[PDB]
């Protein structure tokens, strides 16, 4: 073997996390009792802590969680091998950037892929973000994503947000400053890793197709299972709550108050 991070930049970012830790909010997560998903769209989950019921924004929590995991396992990440025997299933960066109508010319998409591609040795070494070129080295339109970092055992992120990941890696990351660049990449990985927003679908609407129904039901189930078996156990075991997250944790009920209305027969 495991690589020791000699780097001054990673240590400054780890200290910055240490300085933002809210002790009381961290204790709430450390001793959480998971209740369930409230909203798969807005990404709200309900947890019990002692005598209270909390409404949590897990979009915000997974963001800091994956950011923290990224900071700890930096340069020692496992890989999610994204390639199969099916060459047609490959992930082409140029193809992903085509989702952005504002990148209205091949050159603007090529600009983004060029920066990412020039930094492929470090993206692979430090982040396990492996990019490969199938044709000639200068063919940006044939630049492919072969591996992603494996942040949490039992977790494989949805790749629906891959277009945003590449677009933000190419436009938001300050590649010029070591610390800002490194922080930026960890933030991009954390953003991609957050479970997707699942919009609400009306199961009573006869106007909506039969295949769209069982598909919403499957997405609804996949998240509930993810949160309950993978995410919340990890959150409960290692999550350090930053103070900026107090807005994302809301007390909704308390047992003393409930037990004044709900009573034994």
């Amino acid at each position: 073997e495991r690589v020791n991070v000699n780097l001054t930049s990673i240590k400054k970012l780890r200290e910055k996390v240490d300085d933002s830790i809210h002790r009381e909010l961290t204790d709430i997560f450390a001793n959480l009792n998971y209740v369930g998903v409230v909203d798969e769209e807005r990404r709200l989950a309900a947890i019990q802590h002692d005598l209270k019921l909390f409404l949590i924004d897990y979009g915000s929590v997974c963001y800091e969680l994956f950011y923290q995991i990224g900071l700890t396992d930096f340069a020692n990440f496992g890989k999610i091998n994204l390639q199969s025997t099916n060459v047609s299933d490959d992930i082409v960066l140029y193809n992903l950037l085509s989702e952005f109508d504002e990148l209205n010319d091949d050159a603007s998409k090529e600009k983004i892929i060029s920066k990412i591609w020039d930094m492929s040795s470090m993206l692979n070494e430090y982040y396990s973000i492996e990019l490969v070129n199938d044709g000639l080295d200068n063919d940006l339109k044939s630049v492919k994503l072969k591996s992603l970092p494996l942040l949490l055992k039992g977790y494989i992120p949805s790749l629906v947000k891959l277009p945003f990941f590449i677009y933000r890696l190419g436009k938001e990351v300050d590649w010029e400053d070591e610390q800002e660049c490194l922080d930026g990449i960890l933030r991009e990985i954390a953003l991609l890793y957050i479970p997707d927003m699942v919009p609400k679908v009306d199961t009573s609407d006869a106007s909506l197709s039969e295949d769209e129904k069982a598909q919403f039901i499957n997405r609804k189930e996949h998240i509930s299972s993810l949160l309950e078996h993978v995410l919340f156990p990890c959150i409960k075991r290692r999550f350090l709550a930053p103070r900026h997250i107090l807005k994302d944790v809301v007390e909704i009920a308390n047992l003393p108050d409930l037990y004044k209305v709900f009573e034994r027969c």
Binding site: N6, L7, T8, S9, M122, E178
Partner: peptide
Amino acid sequence: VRSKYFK
């Protein structure tokens, strides 16, 4: 320590 990738 600074990163070889940054010069």
